[PDB]
Amino acid sequence: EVQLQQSGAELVKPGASVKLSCTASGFNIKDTYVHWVKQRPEQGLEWIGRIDPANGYTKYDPKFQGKATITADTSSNTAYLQLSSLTSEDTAVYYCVRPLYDYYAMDYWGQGTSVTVSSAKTTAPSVYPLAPVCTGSSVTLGCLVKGYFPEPVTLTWNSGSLSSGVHTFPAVLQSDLYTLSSSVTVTSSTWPSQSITCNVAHPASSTKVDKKIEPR
Amino acid sequence: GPNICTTRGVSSCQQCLAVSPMCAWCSDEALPLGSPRCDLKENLLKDNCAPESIEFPVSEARVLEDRPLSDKGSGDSSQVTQVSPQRIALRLRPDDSKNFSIQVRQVEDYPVDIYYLMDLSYSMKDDLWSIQNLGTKLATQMRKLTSNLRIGFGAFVDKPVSPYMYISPPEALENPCYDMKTTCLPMFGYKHVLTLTDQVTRFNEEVKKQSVSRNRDAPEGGFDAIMQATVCDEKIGWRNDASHLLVFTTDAKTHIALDGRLAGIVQPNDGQCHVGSDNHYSASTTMDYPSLGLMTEKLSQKNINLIFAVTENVVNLYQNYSELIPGTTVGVLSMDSSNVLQLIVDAYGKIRSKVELEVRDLPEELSLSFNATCLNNEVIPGLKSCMGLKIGDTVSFSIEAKVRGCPQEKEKSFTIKPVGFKDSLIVQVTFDCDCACQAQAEPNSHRCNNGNGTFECGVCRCGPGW
Amino acid sequence: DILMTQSPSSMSVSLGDTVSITCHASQGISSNIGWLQQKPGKSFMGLIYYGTNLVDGVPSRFSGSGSGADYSLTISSLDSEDFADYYCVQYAQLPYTFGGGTKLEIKRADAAPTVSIFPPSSEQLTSGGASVVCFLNNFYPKDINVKWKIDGSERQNGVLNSWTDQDSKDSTYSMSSTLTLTKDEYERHNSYTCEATHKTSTSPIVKSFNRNEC
Amino acid sequence: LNLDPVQLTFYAGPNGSQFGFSLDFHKDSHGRVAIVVGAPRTLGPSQEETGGVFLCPWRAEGGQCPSLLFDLRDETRNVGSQTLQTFKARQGLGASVVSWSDVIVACAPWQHWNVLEKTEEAEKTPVGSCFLAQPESGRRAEYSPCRGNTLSRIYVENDFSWDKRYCEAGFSSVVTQAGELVLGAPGGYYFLGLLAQAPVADIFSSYRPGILLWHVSSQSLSFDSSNPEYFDGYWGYSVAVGEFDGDLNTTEYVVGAPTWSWTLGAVEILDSYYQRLHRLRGEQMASYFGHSVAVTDVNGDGRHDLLVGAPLYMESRADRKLAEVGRVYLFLQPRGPHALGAPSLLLTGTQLYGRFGSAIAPLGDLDRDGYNDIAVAAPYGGPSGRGQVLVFLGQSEGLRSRPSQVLDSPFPTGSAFGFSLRGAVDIDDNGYPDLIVGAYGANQVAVYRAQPVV
Ligand SMILES: *[C@@H]1O[C@H](CO)[C@@H](O[C@@H]2O[C@H](CO)[C@@H](O[C@@H]3O[C@H](CO[C@H]4O[C@H](CO)[C@@H](O)[C@H](O)[C@@H]4O)[C@@H](O)[C@H](O[C@H]4O[C@H](CO)[C@@H](O)[C@H](O)[C@@H]4O)[C@@H]3O)[C@H](O)[C@H]2NC(C)=O)[C@H](O)[C@H]1NC(C)=O
Ligand SMILES: *[C@@H]1O[C@H](CO)[C@@H](O[C@@H]2O[C@H](CO)[C@@H](O)[C@H](O)[C@H]2NC(C)=O)[C@H](O)[C@H]1NC(C)=O
Ligand SMILES: N=C(N)c1ccc(-c2ccc(OC[C@@H]3C[C@@H](CC(=O)O)C(=O)N3)cc2)cc1
Ligand SMILES: *[C@@H]1O[C@H](CO)[C@@H](O)[C@H](O)[C@H]1NC(C)=O
Ligand SMILES: [Ca+2]
Ligand SMILES: [Ca+2]
Ligand SMILES: [Ca+2]
Ligand SMILES: [Ca+2]
Ligand SMILES: [Cl-]
Ligand SMILES: [Mn+2]
Ligand SMILES: [Mn+2]
Ligand SMILES: [Mn+2]
């Protein structure tokens, strides 16, 4: 079967360089064209370029001329994409693509490689309990994770016990650092009747802090 | 004493001669009953046989035409003689054999035709430049060997059809050198340029107006051209009484029969002329290349001496074709044809350094044997081909014809001719098997069983129907 | 380059509906177009190439069509797996250019949000910061506008919003707004409010607290 | 021996269409045998020669046949900032046809192809193409492995290495019992010659109309070479298949190269990975040794034997004179893993310019004696030069040195009667295998029925 197995996510500093890979599985990379595509949430999808691994010849969008450099080694059946003089705008997911039948198509896609450019150092999160103000039938608590790098973080209530009625929100980039928040909703007879704890783990700096929510 | 003529116990004059070439017959009335009528000619006169009744044929050979070998092939109106004798009469009796001779001379100062057939594919651009003065340079060197010289010129590339010919862009059809920085002629199969003429400066000035073309595949349709230069007698201008030299130059492989299928061409080469008033081969795109066998047939039919003047990188290739086309000579051409002059002279010398006899229309019952006298009176038995000769030398062959039995047709004729020569020796054979006394036979004779037979040559034969 | 205008940007539909995505180009591309699918938080799968031809393994409910500069992707009878993103891509000319995208979303009945405001924690205030949090859970449709008010006056500097994908259970979205101020500036004022403007209520849903007072 | 030369069956096509240039037997899903005939000069839509294919049902009377319709419109596709072009004018559709299961493979070795990018181009060259059809279902597909999109300048830079622009794929064709189409392309790699293999089923599933350039992953082309012996050798003029290694799971390939090693000509036996096992060298130059190859077991030892045609071989005769007549070579496969030695038998033609060996067809067992037989064509032989097909019977020691039967051409002069042959199929269902002969010069096909031995 056709499968494209890319490299793992990269974490690098601006001005440095990175080289991604795209290993072929179940076929010969030399068979067809190999394209690289950049994906961002706002700018959407952008086409970088292509390479014919049989001979090494390439084509590029004028937008990426200078930063992108595509190469291929038929020996390791692997294709590469090199990015130079990295920037905050180079933070994106990078896919490699090949066609199925049509010489020019874009059909099979690797899983993608997640690149993050940042000057930030490995910082530990700051976990804060969010208790309501001084009534109803449904109560809601919260838990704020601020200023940590890099992603990700795992968050549970009562160490995976309280799972239903929860909303954990995506991380957001707050000045080279990440901010994450989470909420939970139960009945008034549960809290403060039962101790509710916010369990946060940041494996990067290896910290598993826990904050119990206390009323006001 | 008794011999094979008597002991066989023959029944007629005809059967008597058939015993052995030494027998004879006596047709005389006054001959003893016990004495045989079929004995040696010495034994019959011994027994008082009338000399006029003696039937004894002697196998002989007398000349009818015996012109002398010409000293110079110059001048004359094809009255040159290079074979002697030109015609003889031969008489043979059953199972006998007679011997005669023939002389052959490589005449000095014999006219020569030289048609220069040239590859003009782009690989030959620099060759064109070094032969611009070739016509006058070649007139100077051949003048030592002949006073009658005519030269012509033809040119070939390949079949103007895909994939031999570039067909894109549309500009490349008018100028195949389009994607380069020069101009060249559109593709052409083969084109006749100059008929064989004695005005040698016409050669130089047609060469100076020629230019090259360009095709895709290294092998070139040269054989297409060798054919047309051979079978288009009138257009090339081959003279009847002259040595025909066809000089083929190329620096690459050549196409052969059945290669044309890659162009969609499957029709075999018909061996006919197809060069019109436009002087271009019109079947180049519709008729396959020729085969080596078809080429040999036409080269022999028109007495053409083919000469492969090719470059070192393909000498071995054409040396091997030369072995499949007898009478072909090979010379090594430099990469710019600068040495083509000495090559042709050497080839002409090598061509006329051999005399090989050939026999045409030889009856089934006749068999021949040959003895060669090459060099200095040195006999070489069982050989009919001299080698290593020079212009002016002369050889001679001794020939013996042996007949088996007696054939039905009493008068046949066959020819002895050297390969490539105009003149020949015609041998008019006559099989003397019958007796002259048979012409005066008596059908239904009173002497022969009350008319039930026939009286001929002094004996009684059973008539027709018995 | 060739501009790929994909429309609509999103649509709310239900299982079994026959929907049609379109893609309009800046010039003729003569069926040199493909279609892609990206299931939530996953990679891409080929759907169509050369305008109409299916990719091996793809169901027959999908179909491409159109010519010149206008093409159409159609899904007959949607499946639960068919809710994902869909992009068109042209390869009539280099460089290849994609469409903006089109997200298929589960349709359901409208639902007003459950607002909840949260003052800064004790731990945070002791460190030199102050973040007021405003959660807006379980609602539909996704179109919503949050507004922060300090002493009744609007504030736009220092806000940090975040949304979730459509929930797997109830098919409702949720939002999280975070106003971040310094400790010094947090105490210059007393009232804190986050107003919520939805189509479920002409009047904005308001929740607020006052500093010190509780 | 027992072919009926009295009551023939004649099929015929349009005038000048070269109907009969190539033929083969075709069995539908019900086993009903038909005859597929190629006519590489049939008029197209634009009144221009494109070729065509006919599918003749079996009728002892014969007659006209319905066409097997194919797309004859020139194609154009603007994609990848390039323009792809196909030119079917004078392509010769039907210059070789071959059948396997309920599928027909008709090829146009001279279909032209060009790619345009602004001012540059790939050059308009004959890459060759083959058209595949399933007559009962109506399915259609194409296959043209030598199509490329590399521009003319690059080939010059890389020195014409791997130049598949002049393949003329489909020149010769054959299909393995496993269903793997094998095309001969004598013009691949700048007139070196390549072979192209690909499973039929993958061709049908990976083809879509209008794509013009598409991938077939399961395909397998042979390899370029820098050896001057292969230069202008037309490796792929003729092709065939058989079993020559002893392993019954692998299929071996036989390839003709009639101008190999400076027109010495050769035939090579390969594995499915194009690795050379044996190489039979030509005996005489320009003999075109390799013009036709046939594979069948003639001596009945279960081991396939090889037959090679050299239709221009010049026989030696009296007075040092040669005479082009043609010649066929028989090679008997030895027991176990051993090289094919010297030829077991030399069959030499008789009629000058007769081209004895232009076509060779395995007949199966004609007289039903236990040994397979063959037929050899001399399309310009016979006392009239009208054409002859000679039959040679198998025996314990190879083949008989003299023919058992001789089929003289029923057509006028120049019919090329015998240029194509196919046997070993019982078409009237009488238990005896029959023979179909093509005469494209006369645009007809003659069917000889085998009858019980007299
Ligand atoms: C033009 O025609 C000539 C022939 O007239 C060709 O020259 C021949 O080429 C073949 C192929 O290379 C030669 O065949 C080889 O002969 C070897 C023995 O040669 C002996 O005898 C000659 C006689 O002169 C001596 O010169 C030589 O030194 C030896 O004493 C064999 O050993 C060879 O077999 C080996 O190689 C072949 C592959 O080539 C393998 O298949 C064998 O299994 C084995 O490994 C081979 O058979 C032949 O000898 C050559 N003859 C001459 C006189 O040179 C030209 O090639 C041809 N040219 C063109 C352009 O077509
Ligand atoms: C060719 O020469 C041979 C000898 O080399 C001749 O053969 C001999 O001829 C003489 C003639 O007197 C005989 O006596 C011998 O018996 C022959 N010897 C043989 C035949 O071995 C032959 O006659 C010559 N041929 C011609 C045509 O002159
Ligand atoms: N290993 C391979 N696959 C392989 C082998 C051989 C070649 C190759 C390519 C081009 C050649 O020359 C072409 C024209 C002919 C001539 C012009 C004229 O005759 O007019 C001239 O000069 N150039 C000759 C050989 C390419 C690839
Ligand atoms: C025939 O042979 C004899 C004996 O050698 C010779 O004397 C005679 O001259 C020959 N005949 C001719 C015509 O040369
Ligand atoms: Ca095998
Ligand atoms: Ca066998
Ligand atoms: Ca048999
Ligand atoms: Ca039958
Ligand atoms: Cl002479
Ligand atoms: Mn040339
Ligand atoms: Mn040169
Ligand atoms: Mn050529």
Please provide the DSSP assignment of D285-301 as one string: TTS-TTSEEEEE-SSSS
Q: How many CB atoms lie within 10 A of CB D336?
A: 7
What element of type H or E holds B100?
strand B97-105
D136 three-state secondary structure: coil
**Rounded distance between C-alpha atoms, residue D274 and residue D136, angstroms:** 34
**How far apart are alpha carbons D75 and D114 in whole angstroms?**
11
CATH code linked to domain C4-106: 2.60.40.10
Contact yes or no for D79 and C53 at CB 8 A = no
| Residue D271 to residue D195: CA distance in whole angstroms | 12
- Between helix B292-301 and helix B222-231 the angle, nearest 10°, is 30
Number of residues that this document lists for chain C: 214
Are C207 and C134 a contacting pair, CB within 8 Å?
yes
- Whole-angstrom Cα distance, residue B300 to residue B302? 6
Does residue D159 have a known ligand-binding role? no
Give A47 to chain D, closest Cα distance, Å: 13
Phi, psi dihedral angles at B64 (to 5 degrees): -110, -45
Question: Is residue B253 within 8 Å of B281, Cβ to Cβ?
Answer: no
Give SS3 for A73: strand
**D202 assigned ligand-binding residue:** no
User: Could you tell me which of C115, C116, C111 has the C-alpha nearest to residue C171?
Assistant: C111
Q: Whose CA is closest to B384, among D370, D319, C197? A: D319
Tell me the helices (H) and strands (E) count for chain B, helix number first. Answer: 12, 23
Give me the count of residues in chain D: 454
C55 CB within 8 Å of a chain D CB:
no
Asked, colleague to colleague, whether C4-106 and C114-210 share their fold, the answer is yes
E strands in D176-304: 180-185, 194-199, 220-221, 239-242, 252-257, 266-270, 276-281, 292-296
The residues near B187 (Cβ < 8 Å, ≥ 6 apart) are B157, B158, B160, B164, B165, B176, B213, B214, B215
Cα B42 to Cα B45, B50, D17, distances in angstroms: 6, 12, 82
D432 annotated among ligand-binding-site residues: yes
**B1: which residues sit within 8 A by CB, 6+ positions away?**
none
Nearest by CB to residue D206, choosing from A32, A55, A101, is A101
Q: Which of C32, C38, C121 to mutate to test the interface with A (most CBs of A within 10 A)?
A: C121
Residues linked to residue D347 through DSSP beta bridges, in sequence order: D328
Q: Position of tokens 């269902």?
A: D429
Q: How far apart, in whole angstroms, are the C-alpha atoms of residue B311 and residue B251? A: 5
C97-121 burial: b if 16+ Cβ within 10 Å, else e: bbbebbbbbbeeeebebbbbbbbbb
Residue ranges of E strands in A1-137: 3-6, 10-12, 18-25, 34-40, 44-51, 58-60, 68-73, 78-83, 93-98, 108-109, 113-117, 126-130
How many beta carbons lie within 10 A of that of residue C79, not counting itself?
Answer: 11
Domain count for chain D, please give it. 1
Q: How far is CA A102 from CA A5, A106, C33, C51, D213, in A?
A: 22, 9, 11, 11, 6
DSSP secondary structure letter of residue B315:
H
Residue A41, both tokens: 């949430």
Residues 141-180 of C with CB under 8 A from D: none
- Rounded Cα gap, residues C20 and C8, in angstroms: 9
Indicate if A31 and A81 belong to the same structural domain. Answer: yes
Distance set, CA B218 to CA B119, B340, D191, D231 (Å): 12, 22, 10, 10
Residues 6+ apart with CB under 8 A from D342: none
For residues B190 and B156, the answer to whether their CB atoms sit within 8 Å is: yes
Nearest to D81 among C50, C56, C93 (CB): C93
Q: Classify residue C145 by burial, with Cβ atoms within 10 Å: 0-12, 13-18, 19+.
A: exposed
CATH number at residue B342: 3.40.50.410
Please tell me the distance from the alpha carbon of residue D110 to that of residue D94, in angstroms, as a whole number: 11
CA of B352 to the centre of ligand 9 (A): 7
Tokens (6 digits) for A180: 């994450």
The contacts of residue B342 (CB under 8 Å, 6+ apart) are none
- Residues B311 and D267: their CA atoms lie apart, in Å, by 29
Distance from C-alpha of B146 to C-alpha of B7, rounded to nearest angstrom: 66
φ, ψ dihedrals at B297, nearest 5°: -60, -45
Handedness of CA B74, B77, B78, B82 (dihedral sign): negative
Domain boundary pick from A61, A82, A117: A117
Query: In the beta sheet, which residues pair with residue B378?
Result: B374
B20 within 8 A of B96, measured Cβ to Cβ: no
CA A178 vs CA A121, A145, B228: distances in Å: 12, 8, 89
Tell me: cis bond preceding A125? Omega within 30 of 0 counts: no
Whether residue B163 and residue D320 make contact (CB cut-off 8 A), yes or no, is no
- In 3D, which of D312, D309, D297, D195 has the Cα closest to residue D255? D195
CB contact under 8 A, C32 and D81: no
Residues B151 and B136 sit within 8 Å (Cβ to Cβ): no
Which residues, at least 6 apart from A3, have a Cβ–Cβ distance to it below 8 Å?
A24, A25, A26
- Tokens for D133, please give them: 């059809």
Q: What is the 3-state secondary structure (H, E, C) of B10-45?
A: CCCHHHHHCCCCCCEEECCCCCCCCCCCEECHHHHH
For the CA of B119, the nearest atom of ligand 3: 19
Residue A39 CA to residue A33 CA, distance in Å, equals 20
D297 half-sphere exposure, CB direction, 13 A CA radius: 12
Assigned token pair, B224: 């297409």
DSSP character for B324? H
Please list every residue in chain A whose beta carbon sits closer than 8 Å to the beta carbon of residue D208.
101-102
Which residue, among A82, A112, A100, has the nearest Cα to A32 in the 3D structure?
A: A100
D371-to-D202, D330, D357 alpha-carbon distances in Å: 37, 15, 21
Q: What technique solved it?
A: X-ray
Neighbours of D373 (CB within 10 A): 27
Sheet strands (E) in chain A: 3-6, 10-12, 18-25, 34-40, 44-51, 58-60, 68-73, 78-83, 93-98, 108-109, 113-117, 126-130, 138-148, 154-157, 166-168, 172-173, 178-187, 197-202, 207-212
Cα nearest neighbour of A215 on chain C? C121
Q: Where are the beta strands (DSSP E) in D31-128?
A: 33-39, 52-57, 62-63, 75-79, 82-87, 96-100, 103-108, 112-117, 120-121, 125-126
Domain match, A56 and A137 both? no
CB contacts < 8 Å between C and D, how many? 21
CA C7, CA C22: separation in Å to the nearest integer?
A: 6
D265/D230 Cα distance (integer angstroms): 10
Cα separation values, D434 from B380, C117, D59, Å: 60, 95, 14
Please tell me the distance from the alpha carbon of residue C57 to that of residue B265, in angstroms, as a whole number: 47
Cα angle value A186/A191/A196 (rounded, 5°): 85
| Rounded CA separation C168/A164 (Å) | 12
* Beta-carbon count within 10 A of D233 CB: 27
Residue pair D259/D232 in contact (Cβ under 8 Å)? The answer is yes
Pick the closest to residue A50 from C100, D212, D154, C95 (CA basis). Answer: C95
Calpha distance C211→A142 (Å, rounded): 19
CA distance D428 to D34: 10
Count of CB atoms situated within 10 Å of the CB of B290: 26
Of B253, B257, B266, the CB nearest to D312: B257
Same-domain status, A177 and A85:
no
Burial B123-143 (b: 16+ CB within 10 A, else e): bbeebbeebeebbeebbeebe
CB A181 within 8 A of CB A167: no
Q: Is omega for the bond preceding C95 within 30 degrees of 0, making it cis?
A: yes
Residue B371 Cα: closest atom of ligand 2? 1
CB atoms within 10 A of CB B3: 16
Amino acid at the residue D98: V
d(C-alpha D195, C-alpha D237), whole Å: 10
Among A117, A151, A181, the domain-final residue is A117
Angle between helices B134-142 and B340-351 (to 10 degrees): 40
Q: Cα–Cα distance between B89 and B83 in angstroms, integer?
A: 16
Architecture per CATH, domain C114-210, reads as Sandwich (2.60)
What does the alpha-carbon distance between residue D332 and residue D394 come to, in Å, rounded to a whole number? 12
Q: Is the CB of B320 under 6 A from ligand 1?
A: yes
Contacts of B170 (CB under 8 A, 6+ apart): none
Residue D31 · residue D136 · CB < 8 Å: no
Which residues span the domain enclosing A13? 3-117
CB hemisphere CA count around D133 (13 angstroms): 22
Shared domain for A12 and A111, answered yes or no, is: yes
Cα of B339 vs centre of ligand 11, distance in Å, is 13
User: Distance (Å, rounded) from C-alpha B219 to C-alpha D190?
Assistant: 12
Alpha-carbon distance D140 to B84, whole Å? Answer: 77
Q: Are D369 and D268 in contact (CB under 8 A)?
A: no
Whole-angstrom Cα distance, residue A72 to residue C55? 26
Pairing of strands C97-98, B453-456: unpaired
CA C119 vs CA A146, B223, C192, D298, D376: distances in Å? 15, 101, 9, 99, 101
Q: Give the DSSP per-residue string, chain C.
A: ---EEEE-SEEEE-TT--EEEEEEESS--TT-EEEEEE-TTS-EEEEEETTTEEPTT--TTEEEEEETTEEEEEESS--GGG-SEEEEEE-SSSSPEE----EEEE----B--EEEEEPPPHHHHTTTEEEEEEEEEEEBSS--EEEEEETTEEE-TTEEEEE-PPPTTT--EEEEEEEEEEHHHHTT--EEEEEEEETTEEEEEEEEEESS--
Q: Which residues pair with D99 in a beta bridge?
A: D104
CB burial of residue B332 (10 Å; 0-12, 13-18, 19+): middle
* Phi and psi torsions of B324, nearest 5°: -95, 0
**Both A27 and A94 in a single domain?**
yes
State the nearest Cα–Cα gap between A46 and chain C, in angstroms: 7
Q: What angle do CA A189, A193, A194 make, to 5 degrees?
A: 115
Residues C163, A62: C-beta atoms closer than 8 Å: no
What gap in Å lies between CA B440 and CA B458, rounded to an integer? 11
Eight-state DSSP code of residue B275? B
Q: Provide the domain limits for residue D49.
A: 1-454
Q: Are residues A181 and A149 in the same domain?
A: yes
- Gap from C53 CA to chain D (nearest CA, Å): 8
Taking an 8 Å cut-off on Cβ atoms, the answer to whether D210 and C31 are in contact is yes
Question: Distance between CA atoms of D373 and D384, rounded to whole angstroms?
Answer: 26
Domain spans, chain C: 4-106, 114-210
- Please state, in angstroms and rounded to a whole number, the distance separating the CA atoms of residues D171 and D38: 12
**In Å, how far from its chain's centre is CA B68?**
22
In the block, tokens 């419109």 appear at D73
Chains adjacent to A (≥3 CB pairs closer than 8 angstroms): C, D
DSSP H helices in chain A: none
Name every residue whose Cβ is closer than 8 Å to that of residue B112 and which is 6 or more positions away in sequence: B142, B145, B146, B148, B149, B150, B242, B243, B245, B348
